[PDB]
């Protein structure tokens, strides 16, 4: 335990961030995968057709 | 009946060419998908040519009423000369019809492309509030801030 210690003076705050990290990025990548949903939306639905003479 | 009824296929070959006349029957037709009035006035050619006499007689037996019609003049005349032949004429008229439903509106993009013409004639347009909503008085105002122009005005 505590030759670990030695190589990661940071465990105690590594994870801090490993935990901070995953509330905000599982949080934010829906929204920001809806943003991209909410633009494309335009041509997820876009209909064409063909009337020459 | 069917002498029109190629008069009318006729023109709707000509409306073609009528370009500003194309824009405002696509855009109503757009933000007011779905409801009666995206319909254009002149109809598809289709229903053109399925029409009935008799489709008018009902047509013509529902809308054309007293209490949704009315009758003006002006000129050398007076108000009373008129009153009798109303009185006279159209007293026998049939004076006695369903309601409107809320039109809604859309924001939708409509797009024909055509490369092969001169130039495009372009639209754009949003939500109008109605008749009787007083601000409309504003928005006549704002639509001649921006005014108009076209290719002839030496200012």
Known sequence: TF??????????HRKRMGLKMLLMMGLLLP???????HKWSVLKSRKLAYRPP | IEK?????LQELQENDTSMRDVVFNYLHATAFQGTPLAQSVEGPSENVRKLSRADLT?????????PRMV?????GLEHRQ???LAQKHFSGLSGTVPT????RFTGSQICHR???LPLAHVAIAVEGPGWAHPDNVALQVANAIIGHYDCTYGG
């Open chain 1, 31 to 37: 929204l920001v995968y809806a943003m991209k949903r």
């Open chain 2, 58 to 66: 009902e047509y013509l037996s529902r809308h054309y009423k007293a």
């Open chain 2, 82 to 84: 008129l009153l009798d």
């Open chain 2, 100 to 103: 409107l439903s809320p039109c």
């Open chain 2, 114 to 116: 055509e490369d092969g």
């Open chain 2, 4 to 8: 029109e009824r190629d008069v009318i």
């Open chain 2, 71 to 75: 009758l003006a003049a002006a000129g």
């Open chain 1, 3 to 12: 030759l670990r210690w030695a190589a990661e003076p940071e465990h105690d």
